[PDB]
C-alpha cells in the first residue's frame, strides 16, 4: 500500500533525473543528477525492509518509528518533486536517504533482537528507541532539511550504538579469554553511563558527543576481540 | 596493518572530539562530531576485513579490498596532515564512502557463497574488473572529489552486482511463471547494460547505465 505509492513517486523522480542527465550537460552536472537518482534507488531498496519491519514478530516501538520515518521521507520527496533548484532537490533527496538508512538499521535491530537472550539488553534498547522517537518528533516539526539532517544523524549514530551494545553483550556471552571478558564488562558499564547522560542531555549535539564517546569505547573492545 | 589503521583512526577521532569540545558554535560542533562519527563508521568497516580475507572469498574481492584500504590510509594520512577543518571533512567523508565498499564487498562475499546460477561468476568478474579499473583510477586521481566520483560508481556497481544475485534467487525460487520469467528477462537487460558499462570511456556514462539497470531490477523487486 504505502510502499507502492512511495515507489511510484520514486520511479517518477528517477526517470526525470535520468532524462535530464541523458540530455546535454557537463560531466559534473550529469554526475550530480545521477548521484540524486542513485540515492533515490537506494531509498527504494530501503523501502523493501518494511515488509520485515511490518511483520507481526517485530517490536511495535520499532514499527512506529519506521512509520514516522516513512512519513518524513514522503514529505521530503513531495518537496523534491516540486522543487526546481537542483541543489534543493539534491539536499532534499540526501536527507530522505539518510532517513531511509534508519529503516536498514531498524531492520538490523529487529534481526539482532530476535536472537538476543539477555533481558536487560532488551530494556536498554527501549530507552534508546524512546530517545530516537524524541529526535524523530523534532525532525517532523522542522521546516529546514538541514535541521532534519542533524536530528536524523544523531538517530543513526544512536542506533549504531545500540547495535554495538548487542554485539558487546554477545562477546560477553561467549568470549573465553578472561581479559576480553574483563574489558567487555568495563566497556558495557561505561557505555550504559554514557547512554544515561545522552538520555538526560536535551541538547542533540551533546547527545551526539556522548554517543560518539561510547562508540569509540566499544570499538576499542571490538578491535581487541578481532 | 589493520592495527595501525585503527591507531590512526583513534588519533583523528580524539583530536576531533577535542575540537568539538573547544568549539563554541553549535553548527561547527555538529560538523566536527559528524566527522568523528564518520571515522568510527570507518573502523567498523575495517572489522569486515577478516571475513573478506578468508580462504573462501573471491580473490578478486580480496585484491579490491586491499586497494580500498590503501586509498583509505592515504586519505587518513592526508587528514592528519591538513589543518583546514573543511579539508579534513572532505577527506574523511571520501574515506568513509571507500569504507562502505568493504560492507558491500562483505555482502557480495556472502551472496556469492549461495550462487546456484553459475553464469553469474563470469559476469561478476567483469563487474569486479570494472570496479578494479575504477579503483585503480581512484588511486591515481589525487583529487579527493575525483576519488569520490570513481568510488561512487564503484559503490553503485557493487550494489547492482549484489542485486544481480538476488534476482537469480527470485528466478529459481518463484512460483508464478510470469514473475519467474520477468526475473530472467530483467537479468538479460542487465547483462547488456553491464556490457555497455565495460566499454564506456567515462564514469558518468557507466553510472547512467548502472542506474538504468538498478531501476529495472528494483521494478522487479517491487513486483513481488
Short mmCIF file of N, CA, C and O in Angstrom, two decimals, chain B residues 50-163:
data_model
loop_
_atom_site.label_atom_id
_atom_site.label_comp_id
_atom_site.label_asym_id
_atom_site.label_seq_id
_atom_site.Cartn_x
_atom_site.Cartn_y
_atom_site.Cartn_z
N UNK B 50 38.34 -9.33 8.03
CA UNK B 50 38.76 -10.69 8.35
C UNK B 50 37.91 -11.71 7.60
O UNK B 50 38.42 -12.75 7.15
N UNK B 51 36.61 -11.45 7.45
CA UNK B 51 35.80 -12.34 6.63
C UNK B 51 36.18 -12.23 5.15
O UNK B 51 36.19 -13.24 4.44
N UNK B 52 36.52 -11.03 4.70
CA UNK B 52 36.91 -10.83 3.31
C UNK B 52 38.20 -11.58 3.00
O UNK B 52 38.36 -12.13 1.90
N UNK B 53 39.12 -11.63 3.95
CA UNK B 53 40.41 -12.29 3.77
C UNK B 53 40.35 -13.80 4.01
O UNK B 53 41.39 -14.46 3.98
N UNK B 54 39.15 -14.34 4.25
CA UNK B 54 39.00 -15.78 4.40
C UNK B 54 39.30 -16.49 3.08
O UNK B 54 39.26 -15.89 2.00
N UNK B 55 39.59 -17.79 3.18
CA UNK B 55 40.04 -18.54 2.01
C UNK B 55 38.91 -18.77 1.01
O UNK B 55 39.17 -18.92 -0.19
N UNK B 56 37.66 -18.79 1.47
CA UNK B 56 36.53 -18.99 0.58
C UNK B 56 36.23 -17.77 -0.28
O UNK B 56 35.64 -17.92 -1.35
N UNK B 57 36.63 -16.58 0.16
CA UNK B 57 36.25 -15.37 -0.56
C UNK B 57 36.93 -15.30 -1.92
O UNK B 57 38.09 -15.70 -2.08
N UNK B 58 36.20 -14.80 -2.91
CA UNK B 58 36.74 -14.48 -4.22
C UNK B 58 38.03 -13.66 -4.09
O UNK B 58 38.02 -12.61 -3.43
N UNK B 59 39.13 -14.12 -4.68
CA UNK B 59 40.36 -13.30 -4.65
C UNK B 59 40.22 -11.96 -5.33
O UNK B 59 40.92 -11.01 -4.96
N UNK B 60 39.35 -11.84 -6.34
CA UNK B 60 39.11 -10.52 -6.92
C UNK B 60 38.57 -9.57 -5.87
O UNK B 60 38.95 -8.39 -5.83
N UNK B 61 37.69 -10.06 -4.99
CA UNK B 61 37.19 -9.24 -3.89
C UNK B 61 38.33 -8.87 -2.95
O UNK B 61 38.42 -7.73 -2.48
N UNK B 62 39.21 -9.83 -2.65
CA UNK B 62 40.29 -9.57 -1.70
C UNK B 62 41.25 -8.52 -2.24
O UNK B 62 41.67 -7.62 -1.50
N UNK B 63 41.60 -8.60 -3.53
CA UNK B 63 42.50 -7.61 -4.12
C UNK B 63 41.88 -6.22 -4.11
O UNK B 63 42.57 -5.22 -3.86
N UNK B 64 40.58 -6.14 -4.40
CA UNK B 64 39.90 -4.85 -4.38
C UNK B 64 39.88 -4.26 -2.98
O UNK B 64 40.06 -3.05 -2.80
N UNK B 65 39.63 -5.10 -1.97
CA UNK B 65 39.55 -4.63 -0.60
C UNK B 65 40.87 -4.06 -0.14
O UNK B 65 40.90 -3.12 0.66
N UNK B 66 41.98 -4.61 -0.64
CA UNK B 66 43.29 -4.08 -0.26
C UNK B 66 43.59 -2.78 -1.00
O UNK B 66 44.29 -1.92 -0.46
N UNK B 67 43.03 -2.59 -2.21
CA UNK B 67 43.11 -1.29 -2.86
C UNK B 67 42.30 -0.24 -2.09
O UNK B 67 42.71 0.92 -1.98
N UNK B 68 41.13 -0.63 -1.57
CA UNK B 68 40.32 0.30 -0.79
C UNK B 68 41.05 0.71 0.48
O UNK B 68 41.08 1.89 0.85
N UNK B 69 41.65 -0.26 1.16
CA UNK B 69 42.37 0.08 2.38
C UNK B 69 43.56 0.99 2.08
O UNK B 69 43.91 1.83 2.92
N UNK B 70 44.19 0.83 0.91
CA UNK B 70 45.29 1.72 0.55
C UNK B 70 44.78 3.13 0.29
O UNK B 70 45.40 4.11 0.72
N UNK B 71 43.67 3.26 -0.43
CA UNK B 71 43.06 4.57 -0.59
C UNK B 71 42.72 5.19 0.76
O UNK B 71 43.05 6.35 1.02
N UNK B 72 42.10 4.41 1.66
CA UNK B 72 41.68 4.95 2.95
C UNK B 72 42.88 5.43 3.75
O UNK B 72 42.86 6.53 4.33
N UNK B 73 43.92 4.60 3.84
CA UNK B 73 45.14 5.00 4.54
C UNK B 73 45.68 6.32 4.01
O UNK B 73 46.09 7.19 4.78
N UNK B 74 45.69 6.49 2.69
CA UNK B 74 46.21 7.72 2.13
C UNK B 74 45.37 8.91 2.56
O UNK B 74 45.92 9.97 2.91
N UNK B 75 44.04 8.75 2.58
CA UNK B 75 43.17 9.85 2.99
C UNK B 75 43.35 10.17 4.47
O UNK B 75 43.38 11.34 4.86
N UNK B 76 43.50 9.15 5.32
CA UNK B 76 43.70 9.40 6.74
C UNK B 76 45.04 10.11 7.01
O UNK B 76 45.11 11.00 7.87
N UNK B 77 46.10 9.71 6.31
CA UNK B 77 47.37 10.42 6.44
C UNK B 77 47.23 11.88 6.02
O UNK B 77 47.72 12.78 6.70
N UNK B 78 46.51 12.12 4.92
CA UNK B 78 46.24 13.49 4.49
C UNK B 78 45.38 14.24 5.50
O UNK B 78 45.64 15.41 5.80
N UNK B 79 44.33 13.59 6.02
CA UNK B 79 43.51 14.26 7.02
C UNK B 79 44.33 14.60 8.26
O UNK B 79 44.14 15.66 8.87
N UNK B 80 45.27 13.74 8.63
CA UNK B 80 46.12 14.03 9.78
C UNK B 80 47.09 15.17 9.49
O UNK B 80 47.52 15.85 10.43
N UNK B 81 47.44 15.41 8.22
CA UNK B 81 48.37 16.47 7.85
C UNK B 81 47.69 17.82 7.65
O UNK B 81 48.25 18.85 8.05
N UNK B 82 46.51 17.83 7.04
CA UNK B 82 45.80 19.08 6.78
C UNK B 82 45.48 19.81 8.08
O UNK B 82 45.45 19.23 9.17
N UNK B 83 45.24 21.11 7.96
CA UNK B 83 44.87 21.91 9.11
C UNK B 83 43.48 22.49 8.97
O UNK B 83 42.82 22.83 9.96
N UNK B 84 43.04 22.60 7.74
CA UNK B 84 41.73 23.15 7.45
C UNK B 84 40.65 22.16 7.88
O UNK B 84 40.68 21.01 7.43
N UNK B 85 39.70 22.56 8.73
CA UNK B 85 38.59 21.65 9.07
C UNK B 85 37.78 21.21 7.87
O UNK B 85 37.39 20.04 7.78
N UNK B 86 37.52 22.13 6.93
CA UNK B 86 36.76 21.77 5.74
C UNK B 86 37.48 20.71 4.91
O UNK B 86 36.84 19.79 4.39
N UNK B 87 38.80 20.84 4.77
CA UNK B 87 39.56 19.83 4.03
C UNK B 87 39.56 18.49 4.75
O UNK B 87 39.48 17.43 4.11
N UNK B 88 39.65 18.50 6.08
CA UNK B 88 39.58 17.26 6.84
C UNK B 88 38.21 16.59 6.66
O UNK B 88 38.12 15.36 6.56
N UNK B 89 37.14 17.39 6.60
CA UNK B 89 35.79 16.84 6.48
C UNK B 89 35.59 16.18 5.12
O UNK B 89 34.96 15.13 5.03
N UNK B 90 36.11 16.80 4.06
CA UNK B 90 36.00 16.20 2.74
C UNK B 90 36.85 14.94 2.63
O UNK B 90 36.41 13.94 2.04
N UNK B 91 38.06 14.95 3.19
CA UNK B 91 38.93 13.77 3.13
C UNK B 91 38.35 12.62 3.95
O UNK B 91 38.44 11.45 3.54
N UNK B 92 37.79 12.93 5.11
CA UNK B 92 37.22 11.87 5.93
C UNK B 92 36.00 11.30 5.25
O UNK B 92 35.84 10.08 5.17
N UNK B 93 35.16 12.18 4.68
CA UNK B 93 33.94 11.72 4.02
C UNK B 93 34.24 10.75 2.88
O UNK B 93 33.54 9.75 2.71
N UNK B 94 35.26 11.05 2.08
CA UNK B 94 35.57 10.16 0.96
C UNK B 94 36.16 8.85 1.48
O UNK B 94 35.89 7.78 0.92
N UNK B 95 36.97 8.92 2.53
CA UNK B 95 37.45 7.69 3.14
C UNK B 95 36.29 6.83 3.61
O UNK B 95 36.32 5.60 3.47
N UNK B 96 35.25 7.46 4.15
CA UNK B 96 34.10 6.71 4.67
C UNK B 96 33.24 6.13 3.55
O UNK B 96 32.67 5.04 3.71
N UNK B 97 33.14 6.81 2.42
CA UNK B 97 32.50 6.20 1.25
C UNK B 97 33.31 5.00 0.77
O UNK B 97 32.74 3.94 0.45
N UNK B 98 34.63 5.14 0.72
CA UNK B 98 35.50 3.99 0.48
C UNK B 98 35.23 2.87 1.48
O UNK B 98 35.08 1.70 1.10
N UNK B 99 35.14 3.23 2.77
CA UNK B 99 34.93 2.22 3.80
C UNK B 99 33.64 1.44 3.55
O UNK B 99 33.59 0.23 3.80
N UNK B 100 32.62 2.10 3.01
CA UNK B 100 31.35 1.44 2.71
C UNK B 100 31.51 0.31 1.69
O UNK B 100 30.77 -0.68 1.75
N UNK B 101 32.44 0.45 0.74
CA UNK B 101 32.74 -0.63 -0.19
C UNK B 101 33.07 -1.93 0.53
O UNK B 101 32.73 -3.01 0.06
N UNK B 102 33.74 -1.83 1.68
CA UNK B 102 34.05 -3.03 2.45
C UNK B 102 32.79 -3.72 2.95
O UNK B 102 32.73 -4.95 2.98
N UNK B 103 31.77 -2.95 3.35
CA UNK B 103 30.48 -3.54 3.67
C UNK B 103 29.88 -4.22 2.45
O UNK B 103 29.37 -5.34 2.55
N UNK B 104 29.94 -3.56 1.29
CA UNK B 104 29.39 -4.14 0.07
C UNK B 104 30.22 -5.33 -0.41
O UNK B 104 29.66 -6.25 -1.03
N UNK B 105 31.53 -5.31 -0.17
CA UNK B 105 32.35 -6.47 -0.52
C UNK B 105 32.04 -7.65 0.39
O UNK B 105 32.02 -8.80 -0.07
N UNK B 106 31.81 -7.38 1.67
CA UNK B 106 31.40 -8.44 2.58
C UNK B 106 30.09 -9.06 2.12
O UNK B 106 29.97 -10.28 2.00
N UNK B 107 29.10 -8.21 1.83
CA UNK B 107 27.79 -8.71 1.42
C UNK B 107 27.89 -9.49 0.11
O UNK B 107 27.24 -10.54 -0.03
N UNK B 108 28.67 -9.00 -0.85
CA UNK B 108 28.89 -9.76 -2.08
C UNK B 108 29.48 -11.13 -1.78
O UNK B 108 29.04 -12.14 -2.34
N UNK B 109 30.48 -11.19 -0.88
CA UNK B 109 31.04 -12.47 -0.46
C UNK B 109 29.94 -13.42 0.00
O UNK B 109 29.86 -14.56 -0.47
N UNK B 110 29.06 -12.95 0.89
CA UNK B 110 28.02 -13.80 1.45
C UNK B 110 27.06 -14.30 0.37
O UNK B 110 26.74 -15.50 0.31
N UNK B 111 26.58 -13.40 -0.49
CA UNK B 111 25.69 -13.79 -1.58
C UNK B 111 26.39 -14.77 -2.52
O UNK B 111 25.77 -15.72 -3.03
N UNK B 112 27.68 -14.56 -2.78
CA UNK B 112 28.42 -15.42 -3.69
C UNK B 112 28.60 -16.82 -3.13
O UNK B 112 28.88 -17.75 -3.89
N UNK B 113 28.47 -16.98 -1.81
CA UNK B 113 28.56 -18.30 -1.21
C UNK B 113 27.35 -19.15 -1.59
O UNK B 113 27.47 -20.37 -1.70
N UNK B 114 26.20 -18.52 -1.83
CA UNK B 114 24.98 -19.19 -2.30
C UNK B 114 24.68 -18.70 -3.72
O UNK B 114 23.75 -17.92 -3.94
N UNK B 115 25.46 -19.18 -4.69
CA UNK B 115 25.34 -18.77 -6.09
C UNK B 115 25.04 -20.00 -6.94
O UNK B 115 25.93 -20.57 -7.57
N UNK B 116 23.76 -20.40 -6.96
CA UNK B 116 23.35 -21.56 -7.74
C UNK B 116 23.30 -21.28 -9.23
O UNK B 116 23.24 -22.23 -10.02
N UNK B 117 23.32 -20.01 -9.64
CA UNK B 117 23.38 -19.70 -11.07
C UNK B 117 24.83 -19.47 -11.44
O UNK B 117 25.39 -18.40 -11.15
N UNK B 118 25.48 -20.44 -12.07
CA UNK B 118 26.93 -20.34 -12.29
C UNK B 118 27.32 -19.26 -13.29
O UNK B 118 28.45 -18.75 -13.21
N UNK B 119 26.43 -18.91 -14.22
CA UNK B 119 26.75 -17.91 -15.24
C UNK B 119 27.08 -16.56 -14.63
O UNK B 119 27.79 -15.76 -15.27
N UNK B 120 26.58 -16.28 -13.43
CA UNK B 120 26.86 -15.02 -12.76
C UNK B 120 28.36 -14.79 -12.63
O UNK B 120 28.85 -13.67 -12.83
N UNK B 121 29.11 -15.86 -12.32
CA UNK B 121 30.51 -15.72 -11.93
C UNK B 121 31.34 -15.05 -13.02
O UNK B 121 32.16 -14.17 -12.74
N UNK B 122 31.15 -15.48 -14.27
CA UNK B 122 31.85 -14.82 -15.37
C UNK B 122 31.40 -13.37 -15.51
O UNK B 122 32.21 -12.48 -15.80
N UNK B 123 30.10 -13.11 -15.29
CA UNK B 123 29.60 -11.74 -15.35
C UNK B 123 30.15 -10.91 -14.19
O UNK B 123 30.61 -9.78 -14.38
N UNK B 124 30.11 -11.47 -12.97
CA UNK B 124 30.58 -10.73 -11.81
C UNK B 124 32.05 -10.38 -11.94
O UNK B 124 32.47 -9.28 -11.57
N UNK B 125 32.87 -11.30 -12.48
CA UNK B 125 34.28 -11.00 -12.69
C UNK B 125 34.45 -9.80 -13.61
O UNK B 125 35.41 -9.03 -13.45
N UNK B 126 33.54 -9.62 -14.57
CA UNK B 126 33.60 -8.46 -15.45
C UNK B 126 33.25 -7.19 -14.69
O UNK B 126 33.88 -6.14 -14.90
N UNK B 127 32.26 -7.25 -13.80
CA UNK B 127 31.98 -6.12 -12.92
C UNK B 127 33.19 -5.82 -12.05
O UNK B 127 33.70 -4.69 -12.03
N UNK B 128 33.70 -6.83 -11.35
CA UNK B 128 34.85 -6.63 -10.48
C UNK B 128 36.03 -6.05 -11.24
O UNK B 128 36.75 -5.19 -10.72
N UNK B 129 36.24 -6.48 -12.49
CA UNK B 129 37.31 -5.88 -13.28
C UNK B 129 36.97 -4.44 -13.66
O UNK B 129 37.87 -3.62 -13.85
N UNK B 130 35.68 -4.13 -13.78
CA UNK B 130 35.27 -2.74 -13.96
C UNK B 130 35.52 -1.94 -12.68
O UNK B 130 36.06 -0.83 -12.72
N UNK B 131 35.15 -2.52 -11.54
CA UNK B 131 35.42 -1.89 -10.25
C UNK B 131 36.93 -1.74 -10.02
O UNK B 131 37.37 -0.73 -9.46
N UNK B 132 37.74 -2.71 -10.45
CA UNK B 132 39.19 -2.55 -10.33
C UNK B 132 39.68 -1.36 -11.13
O UNK B 132 40.49 -0.56 -10.64
N UNK B 133 39.21 -1.22 -12.38
CA UNK B 133 39.60 -0.08 -13.19
C UNK B 133 39.22 1.23 -12.51
O UNK B 133 40.02 2.17 -12.47
N UNK B 134 38.01 1.29 -11.94
CA UNK B 134 37.62 2.47 -11.18
C UNK B 134 38.56 2.67 -9.99
O UNK B 134 39.12 3.76 -9.80
N UNK B 135 38.78 1.62 -9.20
CA UNK B 135 39.63 1.78 -8.02
C UNK B 135 41.08 2.07 -8.41
O UNK B 135 41.74 2.87 -7.74
N UNK B 136 41.59 1.45 -9.48
CA UNK B 136 42.93 1.80 -9.96
C UNK B 136 43.01 3.27 -10.34
O UNK B 136 43.95 3.98 -9.96
N UNK B 137 42.01 3.77 -11.09
CA UNK B 137 41.99 5.18 -11.43
C UNK B 137 41.77 6.08 -10.21
O UNK B 137 42.22 7.23 -10.20
N UNK B 138 41.07 5.58 -9.18
CA UNK B 138 40.93 6.38 -7.97
C UNK B 138 42.27 6.55 -7.27
O UNK B 138 42.60 7.64 -6.78
N UNK B 139 43.08 5.49 -7.26
CA UNK B 139 44.39 5.58 -6.61
C UNK B 139 45.31 6.56 -7.31
O UNK B 139 46.21 7.12 -6.67
N UNK B 140 45.13 6.76 -8.61
CA UNK B 140 45.92 7.72 -9.37
C UNK B 140 45.27 9.09 -9.46
O UNK B 140 45.83 9.98 -10.09
N UNK B 141 44.11 9.28 -8.81
CA UNK B 141 43.35 10.50 -9.02
C UNK B 141 43.97 11.69 -8.30
O UNK B 141 44.13 12.77 -8.89
N UNK B 142 44.31 11.53 -7.03
CA UNK B 142 44.75 12.70 -6.25
C UNK B 142 43.66 13.65 -5.78
O UNK B 142 43.57 13.95 -4.58
N UNK B 143 42.84 14.16 -6.69
CA UNK B 143 41.70 14.98 -6.32
C UNK B 143 40.73 14.17 -5.46
O UNK B 143 40.17 13.18 -5.95
N UNK B 144 40.52 14.54 -4.20
CA UNK B 144 39.51 13.83 -3.39
C UNK B 144 38.12 13.87 -4.00
O UNK B 144 37.33 12.93 -3.81
N UNK B 145 37.78 14.92 -4.74
CA UNK B 145 36.48 14.97 -5.39
C UNK B 145 36.41 14.02 -6.57
O UNK B 145 35.32 13.56 -6.94
N UNK B 146 37.55 13.70 -7.18
CA UNK B 146 37.52 12.73 -8.27
C UNK B 146 37.56 11.31 -7.73
O UNK B 146 36.98 10.40 -8.34
N UNK B 147 38.24 11.10 -6.61
CA UNK B 147 38.14 9.82 -5.92
C UNK B 147 36.70 9.55 -5.55
O UNK B 147 36.19 8.44 -5.75
N UNK B 148 36.01 10.57 -5.02
CA UNK B 148 34.63 10.42 -4.61
C UNK B 148 33.74 9.98 -5.77
O UNK B 148 32.81 9.20 -5.57
N UNK B 149 33.99 10.51 -6.97
CA UNK B 149 33.16 10.15 -8.11
C UNK B 149 33.40 8.70 -8.51
O UNK B 149 32.46 7.92 -8.68
N UNK B 150 34.68 8.33 -8.66
CA UNK B 150 35.03 6.96 -9.02
C UNK B 150 34.53 5.98 -7.97
O UNK B 150 34.05 4.89 -8.31
N UNK B 151 34.65 6.34 -6.70
CA UNK B 151 34.20 5.46 -5.63
C UNK B 151 32.68 5.35 -5.66
O UNK B 151 32.12 4.28 -5.40
N UNK B 152 32.00 6.43 -6.03
CA UNK B 152 30.55 6.38 -6.05
C UNK B 152 30.03 5.42 -7.11
O UNK B 152 29.06 4.68 -6.88
N UNK B 153 30.65 5.44 -8.29
CA UNK B 153 30.25 4.49 -9.33
C UNK B 153 30.54 3.07 -8.87
O UNK B 153 29.72 2.16 -9.04
N UNK B 154 31.72 2.85 -8.27
CA UNK B 154 32.05 1.51 -7.77
C UNK B 154 31.02 1.03 -6.75
O UNK B 154 30.62 -0.15 -6.77
N UNK B 155 30.59 1.91 -5.84
CA UNK B 155 29.57 1.54 -4.86
C UNK B 155 28.28 1.09 -5.54
O UNK B 155 27.66 0.09 -5.15
N UNK B 156 27.80 1.89 -6.50
CA UNK B 156 26.53 1.58 -7.16
C UNK B 156 26.68 0.34 -8.04
O UNK B 156 25.74 -0.46 -8.18
N UNK B 157 27.86 0.19 -8.67
CA UNK B 157 28.17 -1.01 -9.43
C UNK B 157 28.07 -2.24 -8.56
O UNK B 157 27.38 -3.21 -8.89
N UNK B 158 28.75 -2.21 -7.40
CA UNK B 158 28.65 -3.31 -6.44
C UNK B 158 27.23 -3.51 -5.98
O UNK B 158 26.79 -4.65 -5.77
N UNK B 159 26.48 -2.42 -5.78
CA UNK B 159 25.08 -2.60 -5.43
C UNK B 159 24.32 -3.28 -6.57
O UNK B 159 23.45 -4.13 -6.32
N UNK B 160 24.60 -2.90 -7.81
CA UNK B 160 23.95 -3.56 -8.93
C UNK B 160 24.32 -5.04 -8.97
O UNK B 160 23.45 -5.90 -9.17
N UNK B 161 25.60 -5.36 -8.74
CA UNK B 161 26.06 -6.74 -8.80
C UNK B 161 25.44 -7.58 -7.69
O UNK B 161 25.09 -8.74 -7.91
N UNK B 162 25.30 -6.99 -6.51
CA UNK B 162 24.53 -7.62 -5.44
C UNK B 162 23.09 -7.86 -5.87
O UNK B 162 22.52 -8.93 -5.61
N UNK B 163 22.47 -6.86 -6.49
CA UNK B 163 21.10 -7.03 -6.94
C UNK B 163 21.01 -8.05 -8.07
O UNK B 163 20.03 -8.80 -8.15
#
